[PDB]
Symmetry: C6
Subunit: 230 residues, 6 copies
């Protein structure tokens, strides 16, 4: 059975990161090291300071001192922020809002950096998240169409609903694009990982895991045993 990659979360907030052992804080390195110690191949690192930051050295420490691969997201919205992030040596970045608000910029980024770029999409069902005073979340399939035309290598789809994984949506995206899709959200137990691993032959590549870890539904080693060991 083909392996479902896991990307346990590391959130950088006020220049530190929670680590799940109970909880403690410390550096992003210590949080990512905890996951590596458990058998992780990847971490999904979100720089929340940058998103809403000067954590470049903290991020570079993770890249330089750990074997785990870093997928970095948060505030990668313009030429300077993107170039600086890639200069840190991370394995991959995720673009988010601006990549959908600035489609030509996203295309320019994909053209230049190729498989180092993935695009994140936050969804409630099949609706894109986000509502401001004058802006609304666009049409998911119209957005996907633009990214596909740009040759986006990889999609990260985060279900943000609070009210299991959306298999139908993940299926539709893998079929429209023929690209790897990474799922996030909708995971409450190891059974949800089983459900996602059944989709690996269809193109679901991996899952970001975080909420279920902090909720104590399972540990990372338990998740890796279910998702698959390479």
């Amino acid at each position: 059975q083909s392996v479902l990659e896991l990307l346990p979360a590391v959130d950088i907030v006020d220049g530190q990161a929670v680590r799940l052992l109970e909880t403690s804080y410390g550096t992003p390195l210590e949080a990512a090291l905890n996951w590596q110690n458990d058998g992780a191949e990847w971490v999904h690192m979100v720089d929340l300071d940058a998103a809403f930051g000067n954590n470049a050295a903290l991020i570079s420490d993770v890249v330089s001192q750990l074997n785990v691969k870093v997928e970095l997201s948060g505030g990668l919205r313009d030429d300077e922020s993107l170039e600086r992030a890639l200069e840190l040596g991370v394995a991959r970045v995720n673009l988010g809002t601006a990549a959908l608000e600035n489609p030509e910029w996203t295309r320019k980024a994909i053209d230049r950096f190729g498989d180092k770029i993935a695009v994140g999409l936050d969804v409630r069902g099949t609706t894109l998240a986000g509502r401001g005073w004058t802006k609304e979340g666009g049409d998911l399939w119209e957005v996907l169409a633009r990214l596909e035309d740009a040759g986006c290598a990889r999609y990260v789809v985060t279900d943000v609903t609070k009210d299991g994984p959306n298999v139908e949506l993940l299926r539709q995206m893998v079929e429209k694009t023929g690209k790897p899709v990474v799922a996030s959200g909708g995971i409450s137990s190891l059974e949800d990982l089983r459900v996602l691993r059944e989709l690996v032959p269809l193109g679901v590549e991996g899952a970001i895991v975080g909420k279920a870890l902090y909720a104590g539904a399972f540990t990372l080693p338990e998740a890796l045993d279910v998702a698959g060991r390479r």
Copy 2:
């Protein structure tokens, strides 16, 4: 028996939050996680720094890493503050003073954001709280009348007296508006939760809990057993 939702409090003060285990401080995530671990569906998060702040990343961490829903209040007084708060992805916000001092702004907010907006009212009996040099707390029923005309989805009524829950007031508001009302204050024991849960069929939706928790009157699991488990 219909369930009374509980919204245990998390107060962000100097960029940290007390957690009740004895007390310790740490991040808002750790405080909200403690409640989630106890079975909470919601937390009522007050950004006191913003009210009297740059806690956006701390708040986003809670939203992103926890299953608990966040009702966010504190300093949501103008277009920028409101839009920024909603951009954090929180389930709901509460407006307070400005929403009563700027009725047209409140109406504009309700029109645009709908059920993401609730309005908080601080009361002593049936008098609105607040006295300045030249401003006084307005007429509770005149204020409610304006909010009802605006189509406010939900009210959060906090009894600030220090001298049980005001059943008569909560009854009157649910009947005037036909909207859900969340109670805060006047809770000293589990019996007060019983009293409030009897009002769920009349439209009392939930209770914010905080004072009684810190006073040791009960624990959150004990409260949830009384208020109801879904």
Copy 3:
């Protein structure tokens, strides 16, 4: 026997407060919570940062999360400082030096805010404390006369001598004014609390307690048993 109210001290210094368990520091909330846990009805909170500060959020946390009533003092010397303090929702404030240096301002404050205002007087015997290069402590009875004409609701008299409670002075003030008087200083043992409680029928309302607590002369529960439980 009529109860003598106790107002155990909480001093906010560099944005933190000592807590007496040995001593430890933490937030003003944790200090006030310790007293509440012991049975306190009130705390006497002094913002020393403001007096000699941006502790508004820390103070609001105490008001919002605790059942104990807060009597707040420190740097309440002008329209802005006073209005901001009252906006925090505290039960009562104490004015100090400026209230005696600006009698018309004090009168204006008393007229507007009524029983939310008490005035603190520091004394050595019957002499008002304070000596600068060009200013001296005024005449205690001349100052009291002005406050009485203004209708001051309540006096807090702090004996600052270091060289038991001054029963004669407290008696004279209760008789001149017919107002409640709160005593501070001159307490070295539980017997001093007995002495003060005998004055409750004459108008001594309460005692601030602090020095004797830190000196280990008694604990707060021991003091409350002597002063009276409501």
Copy 4:
């Protein structure tokens, strides 16, 4: 036998103070409280931040919450610094260098504030300490002559040599002035306290103690038993 007062040292450095239990740091209040707990009547508090500072709130906390009397020194060199220090309510201050470099200012201070002012003199044998590029330590007896003419109430003489107490010098000063003299330095054992206590009838009032405490030569209770209990 007349009692020799002890004034154990508290040094405020970077807004904190070492406490001798081993050593730990914390607030000036906690350091002064440790001495009070041991039976101290006085502490000799040096604000080193001010000397070489905004510790006003920390100092006021000590004054307000402790029974121990504070003798405050450090950076009290001009009208503003002196007035601010006295406004903190401390029992006594010590003037140092400026009081000898600005004799008329010192006289003005003594005239206004009387027994709240003592003057500190640092000595090596009978030579005043201090050598700059263009300034030298003046003549001890010529300096004393000016202070005596000014009516200085009290002298604090600190022996700064590192190469027992100088009984002859302390004798000469008490006889020239008829004023109380407080000794500091030259104390290596309890016997040195005995030597100093024999001088109490001649006018040596007290000793600052610090070096011997940190050196472990004795504890404060042991010192108080030797110096005398009132």
Copy 5:
């Protein structure tokens, strides 16, 4: 058998450094001391703050208080940064990107400072790492050719791939240059150290070790036993 030198890593990030005992943070001195305590001759110190800083005093502390030799890298990109680093007294520095982007500057540095200068090259296989919007990693052998013409004393080759040591590349560089080469990356077990030590007679001088230490593959004493004890 000729000894392979080990250069265990110390990364200075936010003015502190992780130490591997589990992990803890503290000063760069404490991290380097841990390695020295284990038998290290060298540490490879990276100032990540400078790279992406004012850690000069922290670095000087290591140089001054420890017997271990420091190889310092990070942000040594111009005349001022280089001169300041060498003024700290470190045994050796490593130049990185600028040394390849500014070949004449690198030559000037090598000419002046000789064997105090080594040049670091980050590689994926035989491709130089780094891709920006308009800049790409140059040709490894063309870069090496320029450094050889400049008389570069020593090369530090870091394999940054995440997808054993590259013996062929290390062989080619030692043969092209006749200079010592230090390897970094590609070490997952003690066997990889054996592989590298076999290359010591060919000119591989040492290995930086870090990833494998934090991964728990071996301890530093275990590594030193394999690499060789002098």
Copy 6:
């Protein structure tokens, strides 16, 4: 046998100092106190913040509260820095680079302050350390000649090589100058202290100790037993 004075090191770095008990950080006072507790007469205090700072209060605390004598070095390079350091009351200072780069200034300092001034010389064998872009370490004997003409009271010679004590150099300097010389570096065991103590009759006065302490070669009490107890 004449005693060899020991001057255990205290390095002030980021306003704190490592203390060797394992290691911990705290204040310079706590570090110097540890040495005093072990029997030290002197500490050699280096203000690395000043060298590469506002540690004046921290330094004054050491001087004022401890019996140990302080030899202070670091950044004493000009009239203001030197005068300020001496105003802290330290027993002695060491001048370093500027004293050799500004010989007339050094002479002016020696003329004014006499035996309070010692000059530090960093050496590799008999070569003065330091190489910049345009400056080189001068000729050791030519530098010494200038200092001797100036009447320098004392020399501190630090061997900075990393590749026992240099008896020949220390001998030559004591004979050229007839002044006390303090050695630093080249100490790996108690035997090296024996070697240095044999030179006391020739004019070697003392040794700074630090590297060997942190390396665990001996403890300070063990060193004092070897160097001599007065």
